[model samples]
Target: SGSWLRDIWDWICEVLSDFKTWLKAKLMPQL
Candidate 1:
């Protein structure tokens, strides 16, 4: 049970990281 919770936490972190990257790209100004 502890390991399963850890896996979920890691997955959430990974998803948040990807979202941040995507947001940065979207906000970039194109010259």
Candidate 2:
């Protein structure tokens, strides 16, 4: 299932999001 994809989106929005996911989204994208 792609349910995790929703969480991934949530991560970007910081919705019930994990910090590491936030880091990966916020910083890793640039690296």
Candidate 3:
């Protein structure tokens, strides 16, 4: 169960990176 959750978290982080990029482009908010 521990490893399973770890893999899921890692996968989410990977996907989130792409989503983050798209969101940034859509928002274009300055930091």
Candidate 4:
């Protein structure tokens, strides 16, 4: 087996996590 897909999946999770955090911190306070 290869790890190519694994790495992609991990990054996708990381990006989503960061985006969620960013929205909570940036959008909640202004609303």
Candidate 5:
């Protein structure tokens, strides 16, 4: 039960990295 937090944290980091790349892609074309 105690280890689940680490897994969630890892997942969140992955999502954040993905969002960063996606945000760049979404904004770069307009500029």
Candidate 6:
């Protein structure tokens, strides 16, 4: 059960990282 929770946390981090990168790329061009 601990391993399953860790996996979910890792997945969420990966998704948030990707979103941040994408937002930076999309906004930097306008700035």
How many clashes show up per model? 0, 0, 0, 0, 0, 0
RMSD of model 3 against the true structure: 2.1
Off by over 4 Å in 3: 29-31
Tell how far residue 7 is off in model 3, in angstroms. Answer: 0.3
Q: What is the TM-score of each candidate against the true structure?
A: 0.52, 0.30, 0.64, 0.49, 0.51, 0.54
Each model's lDDT comes to 0.90, 0.68, 0.87, 0.89, 0.89, 0.87
TM-score of 4: 0.49
lDDT string for model 2 (1-31, tens) is: 6689887776676754566676677785454
Residue-wise lDDT of candidate 1 within 1-31, one digit each (tens)?
3579888889999999999999998898985
Model 2: CA > 4 A from native: 15-31
The digit string of per-residue lDDT tens for model 6 on 1-31 reads: 4579888889999999999998988887554
* Model number with the top TM-score: 3
User: What's the true lDDT of residue 30 in model 1?
Assistant: 81
Which residue pairs collide, candidate 3? none
Clashing pairs in 2: none
lDDT tens digits by residue: candidate 5, 1-31: 5999899999999999999998888787554
User: Could you tell me which 10 consecutive residues in candidate 4 have the lowest summed lDDT?
Assistant: 22-31
Order of quality (TM-score): 3, 6, 1, 5, 4, 2
On the 0 to 100 scale, the lDDT of residue 18 in model 3 is 92
TM-score comparison, 1 vs 4, better candidate: 1
